[PDB]
Amino acid sequence: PAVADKADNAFMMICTALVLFMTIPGIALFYGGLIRGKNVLSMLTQVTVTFALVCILWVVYGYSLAFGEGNNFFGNINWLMLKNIELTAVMGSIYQYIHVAFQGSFACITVGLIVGALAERIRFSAVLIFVVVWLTLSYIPIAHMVWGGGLLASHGALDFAGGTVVHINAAIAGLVGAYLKPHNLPMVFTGTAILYIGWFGFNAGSAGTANEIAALAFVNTVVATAAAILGWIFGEWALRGKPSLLGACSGAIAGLVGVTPACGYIGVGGALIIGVVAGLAGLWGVTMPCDVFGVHGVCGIVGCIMTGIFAASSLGGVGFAEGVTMGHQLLVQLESIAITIVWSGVVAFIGYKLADLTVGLRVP
Amino acid sequence: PAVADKADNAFMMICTALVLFMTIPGIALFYGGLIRGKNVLSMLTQVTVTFALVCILWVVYGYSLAFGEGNNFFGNINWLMLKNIELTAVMGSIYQYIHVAFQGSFACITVGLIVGALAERIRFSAVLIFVVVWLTLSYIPIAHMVWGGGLLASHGALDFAGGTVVHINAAIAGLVGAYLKPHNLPMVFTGTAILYIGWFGFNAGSAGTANEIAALAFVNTVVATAAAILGWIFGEWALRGKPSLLGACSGAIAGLVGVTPACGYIGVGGALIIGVVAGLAGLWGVTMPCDVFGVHGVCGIVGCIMTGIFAASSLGGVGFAEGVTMGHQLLVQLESIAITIVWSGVVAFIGYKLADLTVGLRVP
Amino acid sequence: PAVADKADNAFMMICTALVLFMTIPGIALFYGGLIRGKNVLSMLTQVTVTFALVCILWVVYGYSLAFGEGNNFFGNINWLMLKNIELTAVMGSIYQYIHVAFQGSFACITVGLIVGALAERIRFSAVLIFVVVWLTLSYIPIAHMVWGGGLLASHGALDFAGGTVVHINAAIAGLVGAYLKPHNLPMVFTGTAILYIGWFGFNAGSAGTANEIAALAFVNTVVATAAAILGWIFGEWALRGKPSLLGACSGAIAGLVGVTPACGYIGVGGALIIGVVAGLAGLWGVTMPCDVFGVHGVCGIVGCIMTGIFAASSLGGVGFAEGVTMGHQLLVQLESIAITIVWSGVVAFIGYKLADLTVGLRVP
């Protein structure tokens, strides 16, 4: 019988708290300082209520459908309300309950990334309707595909902490939203700060254990965020003549997003190069609300492609799987992106249409 | 010789930091956004200074008198300044020093819950006087009774993380206070957020170890808070036509309070039902400063009663003690509530009277 | 082969996150509420960008030059980009990578303490230039001397968590700066709160392990901060007739600074006495931006001297080294202070002069 390691339990519970902290209040405060002042209270309210909702859907069927025995695309409905999960059931080296909470917390930040951006111009019941649809039909299957031993995992896709699952996923759902004035920067700074601190639970907890890989993912997190800040600020300086607080924060986020899939597979060299490239591509991206999805999306993609590179032992990475060339890993990452982009697309489109046809989309 | 487990040490120290974070700045910021703007600075000051004071009383005699060898009601004065506690002394599976800090942190949030609410209309030296009296004569004996193997423990009272010790206790002391405009909701949101994040140290650290029970209490924490938010917001929507940010936050707190005694004894089913019922009863409660004590009090009681139910193996709980019916456990919880309510009553009354007769109660 | 303990890994990673949290956003928010409103955005920006920079210099050569095989004053350039540090390399009882991050995080808060104070009246490129110079030529050698088995360590200097390395060091660099209106106190309160919470990672993580010494340093942290608050507030009350929020926060910081070198070597008795003395000396100090350095400096020195005392087994301490009198330990602490003060002096002076002669110091 697999036996739980209390060091890992402790690490994973604390990491889960940190990920929770990313949404409550990190992303809430982040947008809070960015959206028009008359909309903050309502936005803060829609994030909190949809967070609650995402927590509940998860314990009811979310976890089971994402992580239960299933097919290439979804699990089962045989862990409803966590039935048939023994309290002492182990998963990896931790109790399965901690796996339930940790993964659930990722589902939350994904949703809050979308709700925060779209709370301004969406009717409440519409967003609620949306959350249900998209969590169930996009976050869950994609989570199953990447981390639940579904299609993408069984093809060897390297995505440590959710470049596709959290980032590209939410970014698409958000931009379909868009398709269908910064008043408190200190508050934006604060939310960003909290996102960065939580993000350590996020990337490092993704090791499932307090080992050398969690150590690697942690260090790399520091490195990429730092690299991205400077790459962004230098870009901002070169373009605009000077850094701004918003540029600085945005850079942090570019690097964090960009390193998300890679943190556990790459060397600090890899971490730094990925940070710089993510900062600049982010900055390039916003140049070419809604912007957030250009950062998550662009930097999400850039990270996933570059994982397919810096995982190489050659470049200081942990190495690709046996018999996997860097060429092949690159095809694989590209295919995972293409799926994520397309899957989230159809589902969000469906999400908004159902809402639109049920309650109407734009605020009364 | 009992030997300390470094995984538990680590978990418990981090949990202690989280509980500390609940008071500094969680509760301070919570009230900060709620009380009149002209009173915030002074309130923030009275919380910080009484926090310091509670830390000091605890190391001087508080811990020993709450957790030392004693009678049914109080310990001893043989751990003054932690004398006769070996640095390597173990308690449970952690070093006793970590037990000192963790428990001390619970004493703090209890006090800060009261000071925050009453800083507006109480003279400083009066509140100080009060803190000394009530910490010494109410928090300590009740802590001894529930967790120090006193009267209530030796009768089998289920109270995992302080439904009686923290909640009903403070709520009564506060309402006796009362008996004798929300200007920054983002700040209220922020404090609430911090309280929720710390609350994981609070409920889960109450396992004393990073085991499956800490896992259970953590998951349940997420579940109950979520359930409570929705139960509250739906009530608010049904009554008032729409949710508010304050309702949302309040719901979070209803669930957190409501699950406090139960988190370690109940199934996720139990967690959810307790959350919903606590959200609604909270909302019902505030309907029928000062409100905070209606939430802590009502939801404190509701949690303690419902623990006496959902602990049953029958309902997905960990099970009652051997030879204990659910009927008997219900009598026991009810008696613990009745004691807590009454004990805190007399003591707070005494607290305020001494202050009143020494320095006067209302601000000069 | 030395083998990594996952409990310690977990503790140390979480402690590193907490220390990071001290700078992002703790110190940023602290100053944010203190400096003129027109300067906050730019200050927040200079802290974030110099944080990024300090993270990068550290991974490139900082860590190796501070902690590599070297002389009495500096390490080597044989861990460039962490080359020749095996991913599984162990240090103490944790993976060396966690040692890289943890120590790196101390470098950050040191820098942010200076940048925060001087962002108002220094040109950006000047501060940047400065950071590079002073981190490389002062923080690093002093870190090597105290913690990297250099001059000061090999003479038996007791400095648990950086009374000299972080505090006196930064305080001097800052006051040389000076030598060459509080608008949001709630924000000051918030930053202070975050600094205190992070500070537990800071003092306790300095054990390198979740053991009884980390337990001791944690408890003492609570004790000294509490003692300092009251010692300060009582001083403020005695002098000014009443406490202020700023006094309360400042006291917290006096105690935290004052206990920094001592937390791991002294009894709770020692902790309390050191807190009180640090609160008062801090308050005395500010009486006799820029003030911050009077608190860090004075309380830094007071802590380092008093460590040389309360480490004694006689006074409840862990005891001095074999064959070391308390007299001798006192000479040693005094010499460490004198070196730190003088070393940081010359280096900061050089830092500002280079900047001045390159880009100019005062804002255009």
Side-chain angles (χ1 to χ4, degrees), chain A residues 5 8 189 210 212 245 268, chain C residues 6 9 21 45 48 51 81 87:
Chain A
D5 185 310
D8 288 340
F189 175 72
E212 78 279 15
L245 183 55
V268 291
Chain C
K6 304 201 293 202
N9 295 336
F21 194 38
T45 305
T48 307
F51 167 91
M81 280 312 281
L87 158 51

Side-chain angles (χ1 to χ4, degrees), chain C residues 4-5 31 34 36 38 77 89 105 183 239 248 268 283-284 312:
Chain C
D5 185 310
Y31 281 117
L34 273 186
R36 178 58 174 80
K38 75 200 167 196
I77 38 90
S105 66
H183 72 280
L239 289 182
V268 291
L283 172 62
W284 170 84

Side-chain angles (χ1 to χ4, degrees), chain A residues 213-258:
Chain A
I213 298 297
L216 180 54
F218 193 113
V219 171
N220 287 337
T221 292
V222 174
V223 177
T225 317
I229 289 160
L230 314 172
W232 188 301
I233 282 304
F234 163 82
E236 194 156 55
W237 167 91
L239 289 182
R240 289 227 157 255
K242 60 167 174 166
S244 63
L245 183 55
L246 192 49
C249 301
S250 300
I253 298 279
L256 282 162
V257 170

